[PDB]
Design a binder for these strands. Structure first.
Lengths: 146, 257, 171
RNA sequence: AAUAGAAAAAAGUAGGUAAGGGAAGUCGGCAAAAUAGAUCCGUAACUUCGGGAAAAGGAUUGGCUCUGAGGACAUUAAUGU
RNA sequence: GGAAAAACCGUAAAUCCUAUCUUUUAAAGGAAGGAGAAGUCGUAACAAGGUUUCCGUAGGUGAACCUGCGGAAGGAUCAU
RNA sequence: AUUUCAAAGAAUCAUUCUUUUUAAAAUCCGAUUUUGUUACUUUGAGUAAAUUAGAGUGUUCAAAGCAAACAGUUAAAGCAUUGUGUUUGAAUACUAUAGCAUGGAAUAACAAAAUUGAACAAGCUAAAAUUUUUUGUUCUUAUUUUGGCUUAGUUACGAUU
RNA sequence: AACCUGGUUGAUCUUGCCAGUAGUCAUAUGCUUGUCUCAAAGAUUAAGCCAUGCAAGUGAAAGUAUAUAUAUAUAUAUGUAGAAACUGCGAACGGCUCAUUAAAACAGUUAUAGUCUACUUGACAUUUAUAAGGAUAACUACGGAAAAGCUGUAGCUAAUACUUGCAUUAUCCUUUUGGAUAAGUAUUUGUUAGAAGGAAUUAUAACAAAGAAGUAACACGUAAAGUGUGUAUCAAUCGAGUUUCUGACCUAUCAGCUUUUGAUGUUAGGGUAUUGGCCUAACAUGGCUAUGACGGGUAACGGGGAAUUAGAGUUCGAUUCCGGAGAGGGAGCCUGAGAAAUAGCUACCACAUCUAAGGAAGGCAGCAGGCGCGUAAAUUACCCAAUUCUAAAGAAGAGAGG
């Protein structure tokens, strides 16, 4: 089933020869997903079963792209205050974020991400909660105010 | 190269050193030691700029060579040694004992203390570590390591500590009825009773503190020093007893003498 | 070396200033092969000593299922997860598959339980079939290039099946 | 094959090859030489936008010993030929 | 145990060749714009300026321009 | 555009400021206390000094400085148990808009939102808890109770102009 | 002090600019200058080039003295000084410039459950000895080379330099006690068991393997039993690296950029002090872009801040503090806790000094001072008293600094 990349995939720290799989509690008031926990998958950067852990900031964003292996790009839209005119303007910033196999994420879904140790050159958050939500037009042109 | 910085400009030094603009260019930089740089004083400042037993750094050196200063029951020898948040300075020639305390404006005054109370100090524990063989040890803001601490004492509880043996006499719980002293926040140098505790996940924790004039202010948990239990402060507070007059009243008081 | 002087996230060519700092390091890579034990001391930043094994042969190998270890000469390198070059060249690296001389384990089992702690977990037949022919498939776990010795574990069950299939449709 | 042998010089003719220079020779670079196969890169003025273009200009290429990639069948995913 | 010496990857200075870009800067001749005088030739514009003006456009001319075609009134008429 | 309007009391000069109660559900012993997100806004927290605004202070004055003041032709006075000068000052504020905590009624957004979606009462069912326990160092089994699921009923059942 | 006048015309009212006015911690310059306090000053031009001199050392109980000098008591005992030298610690801070550099560096704001950390602080350690092994400097002798902070031999001799290496405590049972048994700190592997933090593959506890390194063969004389020096682990501390979030000047006559030469990701490694395309291999085919990417410009180090402001603002910030960057241009390295160090080193290029020509030595944007450049800028001063730093720490040094 799961593995076929050219090294054995193991879920390290599971243990096999004594006991009585493995997953962790994540905290910060979040809930470990049932689909993560009783899922069968193997990972290393998943926040529910890797060695990685969440610490730092917690932000909400909108998913734009789903098309890498287990990795997503989120846009944070926000309003910038311009002191000259006492007024605002839209500006935005992309955060590349690791996913998990647990969620099933579609372009325009809202996601709650957390900060964690660096997992790739620009992958520096990982997804904690998938807030499902249909969208019209294209997400790249869309504006959510969170 | 790009090593550690050993110099300290006099202007760049903490405001609560209370040094002037025109007095040379470099301050004493505190040596590394049992209290943080920003949260102490170097012994030179205490001797010369506060007590006034020296007019020069040189006179401080002359005083220091003589083993007539003792901090924490032991002789000290470096000029730049830190005074520490709570400690006992003993000047043996004139038989004087000082305990170091904050005023109500935010700086350290050396406060005249009796011989009997001089033999103990108050130590906040910052951490508690479990070391080999299942033996706990507590770690103090006084830079000092405490072996074989009670399991009944936890991280924000303070502890009364002898200076002869270095062992614990008793402890003061951080319970919401205990006297607390503010150590470094905006409202540094006050005493209150602990009104209320607010615990915030992943982030700073704030405690609401009430003054004896019933004024309330909040402060960050990091800098809060338990100082007694509801009967009394466990060490003798300085003149204004940790109570801060408001500016208008303070100026009105100053004039009305 | 480390951490800069490669392209911007946008795809841009970011400018360079700040001449390479010593604390970057990027120390020269070490192969390590199968031969007679020979190790070099390396002085790392802050006086952290590390051990560069350049040749090895004798490791600490653990039978995970019984939690016990014996020291054994390692017969050959047979498969590597990553590039085929390392296995071809007979060079060790962390996650590599070697074969160990099984006589210590065989001897231990016979002494302890009898027949060729948490007793009687009953081997596996595929593993047992390998065991008779006296040289057994194992995965190195420690990092030779860091630790100066190569330490590993006997492969088991599902992991064993995976490595056997990949190692030897079949050419 | 409208001849043969022997000798071996000038000259002729069909050829080679030349230090150092590199068109100074000559009406004239004529002659001769340099180049060239392939793969991988890189490719301007200008243009009727189709081209110019193999532009220009580079790099590589043996022998051996290996590694990876690419199919067809037939057994009840795996297993085989 | 070990100095000299070498070979291989890897850092990689530097030198030269192209290629593009950048910057001033030369150049016969061409063709503009301004500045200067009392120079020549006209009479184009302002009045119905002595062919109403002006636009867009195209051709012509010594130059100012003239003419065609279609517009405008900032026209000389707000009107049988 | 639209979804919670108001009513009563005391202070004060004739207005002003302040308190009480008035739907519904959950929760706690017929009474007691919780209830969208975000912007926004309020307080706060945590903020280097110099600079700067700024309080104190007759540098000869000021620019300044961060000090000083007081009594005494040499002692009184205080307080220490025959000794020791005494009062002291170096405040306060600011330190992006972003980040952190925090009260909030309005104003804005947004979420939730019928070719249909509920809320509860009834019954069956598979998961957990509770009680029991077969047998010469340890393998079972059995009733009961609680959350999830399949199936008729019952409600001011459900949609702003 | 929330301010306006002169100029289109024959005269007029507008629009509109130009001219005036004031300031400018903003430079230059012209004339004049009696006082006193206060005090910026080779940044704009050349991160151009540099003569000479100076700018980092260090021993007051406490590693090493048969160079040598010396005071007491009886060749001897103690001592006291001590040139010289090994060793130790510092010299990786300071100070200077602002060329580079426009999501870079920087400011606030996180994180370090991803790490390193000398001096200093407090806890506090485990598998022959009435005292161990050399070999080396200064030093002695012979020397060489025009010259250099050049150094050759041979004979010596010490060390807290270098190098060996000596027990004894704890666990379970009768029951104060009498017996039996255990006994490696980091680190690393495999196996499991599980006081705290928001969350643990965490502290920790056990089992089976490996395993550094140590735990005084050192020096004083302290309290009417002490100190220095070295030392494993932990914590503290002075800090450092990465690292989250958010914030910038001008330009579209720069619109598609980036991916063979890692661009974006996945896996596995290697490497790091540690995370990571940080680097190798294999595999994906992405990532960024008019909400301005990718380029170009900047006479652009950033910020604290400065000038001008009624209120908005606009310009300025080489320059006292903080942070960054760099030491002629690039590059590479050693040592050590800390360096890709520049009064450490190696090379190249660009410059350039001494040389008897064989070779040698070099880097002022330290302070002075010179040349050049220029619109544009001071003494080859005196002093370590204060301010501080460094040292084997009073007492010595410091063109840091005054």
């Amino acid at each position: 089933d799961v593995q076929h990349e050219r090294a054995y995939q193991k879920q390290e720290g599971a243990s096999f020869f004594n006991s009585k799989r493995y997953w962790k509690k994540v905290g910060l008031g979040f809930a470990t997903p049932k689909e993560a926990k009783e899922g069968v998958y193997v990972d290393k950067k998943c926040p529910f079963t890797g060695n990685v852990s969440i610490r730092g900031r917690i932000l909400k964003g909108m998913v734009i792209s789903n098309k890498m292996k287990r990795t997503i790009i989120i846009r944070r839209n926000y309003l910038h205050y311009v002191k000259k005119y006492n007024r605002f303007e839209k500006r935005h910033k992309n955060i590349p974020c690791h996913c998990s196999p647990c969620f099933d994420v579609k372009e325009g879904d809202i996601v709650t991400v957390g900060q964690c140790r660096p997992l790739s050159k620009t992958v520096r958050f990982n997804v904690l909660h998938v807030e499902k939500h249909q969208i019209f037009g294209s997400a790249r042109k869309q504006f959510v105010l969170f | 190269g790009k090593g550690i910085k050993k110099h300290l400009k006099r202007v760049n030094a903490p405001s609560h050193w209370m040094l002037n603009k025109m007095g040379g260019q470099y301050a004493p930089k505190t040596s590394s030691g049992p209290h943080k740089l920003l949260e102490s004083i170097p012994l030179v400042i205490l001797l010369r700029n506060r007590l006034k037993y020296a007019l020069t750094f040189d006179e401080v050196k002359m005083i220091l060579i003589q083993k007539i200063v003792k901090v924490d029951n032991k002789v000290r020898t470096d000029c730049t040694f830190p005074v520490g948040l709570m400690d006992v300075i003993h000047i043996t020639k004139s038989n004087e004992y000082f305990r170091l305390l904050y005023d109500i404006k935010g700086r350290f005054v050396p406060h005249r203390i009796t011989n009997e109370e001089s033999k103990y100090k108050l130590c906040k524990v910052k951490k508690i570590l479990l070391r080999k063989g299942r033996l706990s040890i507590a770690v103090t803001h006084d830079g000092r390591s405490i072996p074989y601490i009670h399991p009944d004492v936890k991280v924000n509880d303070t502890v009364r500590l002898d200076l002869e043996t270095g062992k614990v006499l008793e402890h003061l719980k951080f319970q919401v009825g205990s006297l607390v002293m503010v150590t470094a926040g905006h409202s540094v140098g006050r005493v209150g009773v602990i009104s209320s505790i607010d615990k915030n996940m992943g982030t700073y924790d704030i405690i609401h503190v009430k003054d004896s004039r019933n004024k309330v202010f909040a402060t960050r948990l990091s800098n809060v020093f338990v100082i007694g239990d509801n009967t009394k402060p466990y060490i003798s507070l300085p003149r204004e007893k940790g109570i801060k007059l408001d500016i208008i009243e303070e100026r009105r008081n100053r004039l009305k003498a | 070396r480390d951490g800069r002087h490669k392209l911007r996230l946008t795809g841009g060519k970011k400018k360079i200033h700040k001449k390479k700092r010593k604390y970057e390091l990027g120390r020269p890579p070490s192969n390590t092969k199968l031969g007679s034990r020979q190790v070099h001391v390396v002085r790392g930043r802050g006086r952290n000593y590390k051990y560069r094994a350049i040749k090895l042969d004798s490791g600490s190998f653990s039978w995970p299922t019984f939690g016990i270890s014996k020291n054994t000469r390692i017969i050959d390198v047979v498969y590597n997860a990553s590039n085929n070059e390392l296995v071809r060249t007979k060079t060790l690296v962390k996650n590599c598959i070697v074969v160990i001389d099984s006589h210590p384990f065989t001897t231990w089992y016979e002494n302890t339980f009898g027949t060729t702690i948490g007793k009687s977990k009953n081997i596996d037949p595929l593993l047992l079939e390998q065991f008779k022919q006296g040289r057994v498939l194992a995965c190195i776990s420690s990092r030779p290039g860091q630790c100066g010795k190569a330490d590993g574990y006997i492969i088991e069950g599902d992991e064993l099946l995976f490595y056997k299939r990949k190692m030897d449709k079949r050419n």
